[PDB]
């Protein structure tokens, strides 16, 4: 709480990244406290205080890395992926272990959230594609095995390279990917079938059991990732994929919220652009 | 009519004539540098009304006349239109002898009263013959443009306008000699064989503050057509076409980027503003009518 | 004008589209208001003249 | 994606699938808006870090 | 209309002839609103005596509906087919006055008829006489009414309608006020933006600075 | 009454353009004077056009130029054949002795001149254009002259109707300093105001009828009942679904259309940042 | 051969005609705009920096 109190009264504007953010994120990560630091991560952080040159680049890389771990502890994979992407794209022509770890966790989170590794923006530093990638090789082949869509082979590959994952403290993320492969396969099944037997689903997803397949489908229905119903008279599962019809005030409210966010973004961009034009750096004769 | 301004408004400076600025812009001659210079023609309400009335009053014959105004920047302003005592057949008009005496005398008399504008163009009516430049209009417009440079050819169709309920006014300017530079072919068809010789212009209309104030009380029974306006239903095809052209403009701007984005943004803003205005009118109607006795 | 659904044995002649009916009913309401005002003016010209004069000021 | 159909393995029937144009359009427009907002919020931080000239020395 | 001749020819009559004329009026096709007739002094004084049943029947025709008629079937004198048809048509008009979408079950209950064909025929023949305009629908079993005539009103209910009209006026006023507020705010926004533009004006002052250096 | 006069919606536009142009030229508002033309059919007078006139000032008196009028009369006959001088117009408020002096002077040209008065600086919703007729009364002694008020009509040609509708529906004449939202909402405000005035008159009439101070009409009251039993127009569920669908569609059209404007502002900002901040 | 606009329901032995596909082409147009905007967004986020 001391650093949380210090941040509001020492830094100027709520959109300003400071070095003490990294320290507070480290304290929250090491103390297994994730709730107090939430309001300090939900707000997008723009502009960095100079700190009279005392703000080293490392303090930046830590803030978007340790905080990323926080978003992997609260099951918020989108913001974790965004934080890891921001950490990776830092322009720096020197190898750092923080960048390597951020790249590995970015690969893992992209494999968990989506069925493939999200393509990094092309404006990132070229050192990532020259030194970072060759050193982080087990994660790339793990991604390849995940993309080939063979749940049986993923377990064997995890067993083969267990020592690398345990050395890098990743026992708890790759297993989530292995578990989510089954959900991805089930969703792809819903992309084709309309009414499927539980035994047939167990055989296709290699879940080895109709009861286990029923339990997985029930869990996914509870989570909301899938739209399905279970008829136990014949042990069948049906898919009713008609969730929204876009005829209710709720979607109007959603569009209103998107409009408000876009308008605020545009106003902030215009204010920054008008602030930029004061400097006489260029535009002399052109 | 209250809670606003009643003095000289922001739509009255268009009616003001500055002699010094016109003399400077006539001496500058910026048209000769870039030949695709003029692209907009702003016509007063009075000029358009007089043109339409004179074209329709001629019946099946063709009529012709002049139009006064000025030029500013990239736009040509046409303020007044006065007819001519021409005797034309169903196809061709001549304006042999009495037309030129009428031109000179009318310009002098108008200058006597206070009309400070000079002649800015000529117009001629096609009685049901579309809106395009014929092989004789092209020649005469080239003749006028060679020496009296600020000029524009306005073509009006009275019969088609009265039959379809929409005015058909086209502003055109001719390229000089030797200036070469499921989609419909009407782009080439609706022009004559000289389609590559002349180019059209964007026609817009304007009116003064007193004009709008007096036209507001023109008639008190269009309120029914405003309450039961049924917007977003009579111009859905217009909005779909605008969206298509906007997508094409966005593609062109994206290709260029890899200043064109400004006009694409303007078109998108215009279409969105029209849609939002329609929705606002519908919401107002719903609040007015269906929210009573619930 | 209309179509036939054979299994249900139903001939559909025509159906409205809601919003155009809304506009038509609004127009009919406005016409009724205008007709009632005209009849009111016709039956008591002096009273309606006085009422309009009072309302204008 | 070669054939748009759904298999019903209860009576073994291949049903045809009709895509709802309005719903798909709305969903993809919302997805595009979300992606654009994320890209903007990333680019603003990129510009801010470029102004400070942050790099590992 | 037609009631003018009836009231003119019944102005100077009284007694059993008055009851006969009342029955003829109730049997006369094309007459559906008996408003001016009830204002006659003879009909008003007909209340006292042994012929009050005719006045009650006239009041029921003017204001009441078919269920009210069947409530006192024995009290009122017997009626022919034309009177019952007119009463049913007036009941349909009264039902359509409240709601513009009348279910078939409600019409069957109030009009006391069994077959759906009979109800459809009655509605069609009521549409023919132009008292109401609308379309039937068998898919959803409902009748949609676009326009209906204004039935007779009592003297003491006028304030009622007045109230409703007042409400409408109020609503209009509210809407107008809101519109004004909106436009004012819009204008303010515009002016605020123009202020920002004038701030860009200050920029050329910095240009003067580069004149010094 | 008197002579039925038919006014076209082209004279008024001529007067308004005249007034606007001379006010802009002189900086300050002035008084404009011209001459009307039209046709005389039996007991009917029709005014269909007008041309400007030249007037001089001698101290306080205003004198209409005659030679210029004669030249204009000879000139205008070439284009318009069945057109004759009918009256003369001016812009002003209440009648003035200067107007009566000008009318008496103009009377030397035509037997029965009209007098069209336009109000460019009106301060009410009353009709700003008024047609006055000056018939020489037989009052002896001093010439007590009061121009009789005329209830003019709005006789209009078909092409005139088309042009008038086109200019009335015009909206691009502004869209400058004044927001287009204001122009869009003004029409709705005026329409709602007129509907509210009509329904207020109906409410006043029914209140008077229920008060008992006016004769009781059994037909108008039932017509009012029929009108008042239908305010909730088409409150079905299908209409609500259609309305929500339209609102959602317009919301999507606004989202796609704000995104592009934000992207354009993005492009401008990045272009400015890549020159004034980029190190070459 | 595109001479009959309809489909065949084999289970119920039915033929369903094509009294559908109303003027929803507007949506299609919007779709185009969508993808265009997406590309342009990238062109602003990776224009130069």
Curated annotation (Swiss-Prot), chain C:
User: What is its subcellular localisation?
Assistant: Cytoplasm; Nucleus; Cytoplasmic vesicle, Secretory vesicle, Synaptic vesicle
Q: Which stretches are annotated as coiled coil?
A: none
Q: Which domain of life is it from?
A: Eukaryota
How is the subunit organization of this protein annotated in UniProt?
Component of the CSN complex, composed of COPS1/GPS1, COPS2, COPS3, COPS4, COPS5, COPS6, COPS7 (COPS7A or COPS7B), COPS8 and COPS9 isoform 1. In the complex, it probably interacts directly with COPS1, COPS2, COPS3, COPS5, COPS6, COPS7 (COPS7A or COPS7B) and COPS8. Interacts with TOR1A; the interaction is direct and associates TOR1A and SNAPIN with the CSN complex. Interacts with STON2; controls STON2 neddylation levels. Interacts with ERCC6.
What task does this protein carry out? Component of the COP9 signalosome complex (CSN), a complex involved in various cellular and developmental processes. The CSN complex is an essential regulator of the ubiquitin (Ubl) conjugation pathway by mediating the deneddylation of the cullin subunits of SCF-type E3 ligase complexes, leading to decrease the Ubl ligase activity of SCF-type complexes such as SCF, CSA or DDB2. Also involved in the deneddylation of non-cullin subunits such as STON2.
Q: Which family does it belong to?
A: Belongs to the CSN4 family.
Q: What is this protein called?
A: COP9 signalosome complex subunit 4
Portion held of the full protein: 349 to 405 of 406
From Swiss-Prot, chain D:
- List where in the cell it is found: Cytoplasm; Nucleus
Q: Extract the coiled-coil ranges from the record.
A: none
The entry's note on the tissues where this protein occurs is: Widely expressed.
On the tree of life, the source organism's domain of life is Eukaryota
Q: What is known of its domains?
A: The PCI domain is necessary and sufficient for the interactions with other CSN subunits of the complex. Mediates the interaction with CAPN8.
* Family (UniProt): Belongs to the CSN1 family.
What function does the entry list?
Answer: Essential component of the COP9 signalosome complex (CSN), a complex involved in various cellular and developmental processes. The CSN complex is an essential regulator of the ubiquitin (Ubl) conjugation pathway by mediating the deneddylation of the cullin subunits of SCF-type E3 ligase complexes, leading to decrease the Ubl ligase activity of SCF-type complexes such as SCF, CSA or DDB2. The complex is also involved in phosphorylation of p53/TP53, c-jun/JUN, IkappaBalpha/NFKBIA, ITPK1 and IRF8/ICSBP, possibly via its association with CK2 and PKD kinases.
Quaternary structure and interacting proteins, as annotated: Component of the CSN complex, composed of COPS1/GPS1, COPS2, COPS3, COPS4, COPS5, COPS6, COPS7 (COPS7A or COPS7B), COPS8 and COPS9 isoform 1. In the complex, it probably interacts directly with COPS2, COPS3, COPS4 and COPS5. Interacts directly with inositol kinase ITPK1. Interacts with CAPN8. Interacts with USP48. Interacts with ASB4; this interaction negatively regulates GPS1.
The protein's name is: COP9 signalosome complex subunit 1
**Covered range within the whole protein?**
411 to 467 of 491
UniProtKB/Swiss-Prot annotation, chain F:
Is the keyword Oxidoreductase in the record? no
Region annotation (Interaction with Vpr) ranges = 175-280
Listed A to Z, the keywords are: Cytoplasm, Host-virus interaction, Nucleus, Signalosome
**Pfam family of the protein (one):** MitMem_reg
Instruction: Cite the CDD domains for this sequence.
Output: MPN_CSN6
Tell me which residues make up the MPN domain.
5-138
Location comes to: Nucleus; Cytoplasm; Cytoplasm, Perinuclear region
One term under GO cellular component: nucleus
**Coiled-coil intervals:** none
Q: In which tissues is it expressed?
A: Widely expressed.
One GO biological process this protein is involved in is: protein neddylation
Role description = Component of the COP9 signalosome complex (CSN), a complex involved in various cellular and developmental processes. The CSN complex is an essential regulator of the ubiquitin (Ubl) conjugation pathway by mediating the deneddylation of the cullin subunits of SCF-type E3 ligase complexes, leading to decrease the Ubl ligase activity of SCF-type complexes such as SCF, CSA or DDB2. The complex is also involved in phosphorylation of p53/TP53, c-jun/JUN, IkappaBalpha/NFKBIA, ITPK1 and IRF8, possibly via its association with CK2 and PKD kinases.
Family that this chain belongs to = Belongs to the peptidase M67A family. CSN6 subfamily.
Would you tell me the protein name for this molecule?
COP9 signalosome complex subunit 6
Which species is this record about?
Answer: Homo sapiens
Swiss-Prot record, chain G:
Signal peptide residues are none
What PTMs does it carry? Answer: Phosphorylated by CK2 and PKD kinases.
State the compartments where it is located.
Cytoplasm; Nucleus
User: Which cysteines are cross-linked by disulfides?
Assistant: none
Q: State what this protein does.
A: Essential component of the COP9 signalosome complex (CSN), a complex involved in various cellular and developmental processes. The CSN complex is an essential regulator of the ubiquitin (Ubl) conjugation pathway by mediating the deneddylation of the cullin subunits of SCF-type E3 ligase complexes, leading to decrease the Ubl ligase activity of SCF-type complexes such as SCF, CSA or DDB2. The complex is also involved in phosphorylation of p53/TP53, c-jun/JUN, IkappaBalpha/NFKBIA, ITPK1 and IRF8/ICSBP, possibly via its association with CK2 and PKD kinases.
User: What does the subunit section of this Swiss-Prot or TrEMBL entry state?
Assistant: Component of the CSN complex, composed of COPS1/GPS1, COPS2, COPS3, COPS4, COPS5, COPS6, COPS7 (COPS7A or COPS7B), COPS8 and COPS9 isoform 1. In the complex, it probably interacts directly with COPS1, COPS4, COPS5, COPS6 and COPS7 (COPS7A or COPS7B). Specifically interacts with the ligand binding domain of the thyroid receptor (TR). Does not require the presence of thyroid hormone for its interaction. Interacts with CUL1 and CUL2. Interacts with IRF8/ICSBP1 and with nuclear receptors NR2F1 and NR0B1. Interacts with NIF3L1.
Would you identify the family this protein belongs to, as annotated? Belongs to the CSN2 family.
Name-wise, this protein is COP9 signalosome complex subunit 2
Q: Which residues of the full protein are shown?
A: 395 to 443 of 443
